[PDB]
Amino acid sequence: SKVLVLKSSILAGYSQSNQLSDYFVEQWREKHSADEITVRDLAANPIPVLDGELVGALRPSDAPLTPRQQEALALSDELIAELKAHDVIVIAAPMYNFNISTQLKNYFDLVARAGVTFRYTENGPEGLVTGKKAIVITSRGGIHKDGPTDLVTPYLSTFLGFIGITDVKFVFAEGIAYGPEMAAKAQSDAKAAIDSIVSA
Amino acid sequence: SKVLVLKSSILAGYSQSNQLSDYFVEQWREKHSADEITVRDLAANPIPVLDGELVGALRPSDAPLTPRQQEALALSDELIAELKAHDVIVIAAPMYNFNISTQLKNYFDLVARAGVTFRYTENGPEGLVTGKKAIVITSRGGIHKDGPTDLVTPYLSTFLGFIGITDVKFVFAEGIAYGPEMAAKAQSDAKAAIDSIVSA
Ligand SMILES: Cc1cc2nc3c(=O)[nH]c(=O)nc-3n(C[C@H](O)[C@H](O)[C@H](O)COP(=O)(O)O)c2cc1C
Ligand SMILES: Cc1cc2nc3c(=O)[nH]c(=O)nc-3n(C[C@H](O)[C@H](O)[C@H](O)COP(=O)(O)O)c2cc1C
């Protein structure tokens, strides 16, 4: 198949989720070497903030668009085509201030578009990005998993399910802020979880 | 007292949460006319995205800061001083793509700072923005309240509680996307909720 890797950390080479994404990539190339892999780093190639002007680019219109709107529309179309073009979608979602990173959020805000990645319907909202497996690699400083301060995990499930990606496996790298021994254990635990997704 | 109003809609004068924030303001001036009121529109006066460079401004250091870091630090300090300087904090939090707006998020990402608005401690993390009443005015297109697709409400409670704002009252303006009759009912329901916060 084709694997999409989205990175969203603001910590570059020091990023725990990026080191895990990279590992994922190495393991996929090893086991499934026909497959092509695309990596988009939403920190190194930043998506603009959704503001009052750019939101108009995302609505179906025959009104003229400002230069920024045109650019934001073309960038929207490129992100969505890329997303639809891949089978396995890997999303690094570090938690910052109990949310995902703004770098990832801006990608979602350009990707969620009525009549393109979802559509309204007699029988509720329906997702149009179909037939995908998503793996979410989520790194955190503290320990949040299965608890009430983990809003990141239910939100990703909600947003991805919305646009049609309902097959999502979460990999967790938690306790990073406790120091290098805990960071190393997180990496080792998370790497075993990846190993079994890849070898399934 | 002193009332802080934060607006975060990208829809300007057409914004439901901004029309409610405005109403809040009129009612507070009416009942408590000694009080001063500050309004910061985080869409009209945008906070920058937290990236790899700006995050360094928010860590206590004696390393030289780049021009952007300096600017982001001064802007951080101005936002936090303002927040600490007010008694009642009103936050318009429209839901976009199951999250708050990026405009609000960027404010939070500059406001959440170790040793300034929170501090670590034997007995867990502890909030340093203390003694505040928060009112959150949250507008949505659909109907989410008390259900599993409402991640916005638990996240605001979590983030605000984290920095010490644990007294939070939510006002809801839902079903906006069903049209002007539902939008008008939402406004009327939300306005009664505000009336009883103000008159308490
Ligand atoms: C701006 C910022 C905010 C953070 N907020 C949280 C937080 O809400 N909860 C948490 O458990 N860790 C928090 N952390 C720690 C990160 O989740 C941890 O460093 C994680 O490894 C980040 O993923 P990454 O290294 O891929 O960037 C924060 C780190 C930064 C830089
Ligand atoms: C970019 C965008 C995304 C939206 N996503 C949601 C959504 O996730 N759920 C929802 O119920 N309504 C959604 N809406 C509808 C808004 O929540 C509704 O229009 C609300 O009134 C916005 O608050 P405001 O008018 O103050 O901007 C969205 C609107 C926009 C423009």
Q: Go through the domains of chain A in sequence order and give each one's CATH number.
A: 1-200 (3.40.50.360)
| Nearest residue to A79 (alpha-carbon basis) of A49, A47, A54, A51 | A47
Asked if B73 and B65 count as a contact pair (C-beta separation under 8 A), the reply is: yes
Q: Residue holding tokens 């790194």?
A: A139
List CB contacts of A184: < 8 A, sequence separation 6 or more. Answer: none
Residue B17 has phi, psi (to 5 degrees) of -70, -35
> Are the beta carbons of A46 and B49 separated by less than 8 Å?
yes
Cβ distance B110 to B79 under 8 Å?
Answer: yes
Taking CB atoms and an 8 Å limit, are B151 and A158 in contact across chains? yes
Residue with CA at minimum distance from ligand 2 atom 10: B141
Pocket test for ligand 1, best of A15, A96, A136 (most atoms within 8 A of CB): A96
Minimal CA–CA distance to A84: which of A180, A2, A140? A2
Resolution in A: 2.2
Distance, first Cα to last Cα, chain A = 14
Q: Is B115 on the interface with A (CB under 8 A)?
A: no
Cα separation, B60 vs B114, whole angstroms:
9
Going by alpha carbons, the residue nearest to atom 12 of ligand 2 is B141
Distance of alpha carbon B3 from the chain centroid: 12
Residue A114 has what DSSP assignment? Answer: B
Positive or negative, the Cα torsion across B143, B26, B104, B158? negative
Interface check A23 vs B, CB under 8 A = no
Size of interface A-B (CB pairs under 8 A): 88
Which backbone phi and psi does A47 adopt, to 5 degrees?
A: -90, 140
* Method used to obtain the model: X-ray
In the numeric block, which tokens belong to residue A13? 């080479």
Distance of CA B195 to the CA centre of its chain: 19
Structure tokens at B106: 């960027």
Q: List phi, psi (to 5°) of A95.
A: -95, 125
Q: Yes or no: say if A90 and A24 are a contact pair by the CB < 8 Å rule.
A: yes
Residues of A in contact with B46 (CB under 8 A): 49, 51
- Residue position matching structure tokens 């070898």: A199
Question: What CA–CA distances, in Å, run from A148 to A139, A143, A154, B95?
Answer: 16, 11, 10, 20
Q: Which of A61, A157, A63, A60 is nearest to A115 (CA)?
A: A60
Question: Do A191 and A199 touch, CB atoms closer than 8 A?
Answer: no
> Which residue precedes each gap in chain B (C to N above 2.5 Å)?
none
Rounded Cα–Cα distance for residues B58 and B53 (Å): 10
Residues 30-69 of B with CB under 8 A from A: 43, 46, 49-52, 55
Closest by CA to B23, choosing from A45, B15, B85, is: B15
Residue B78: CA atoms inside 13 Å, Cβ hemisphere, count? Answer: 8
Alpha helical stretches, state H, B11-136: 16-31, 54-57, 67-84, 102-111
The residues near B124 (Cβ < 8 Å, ≥ 6 apart) are none
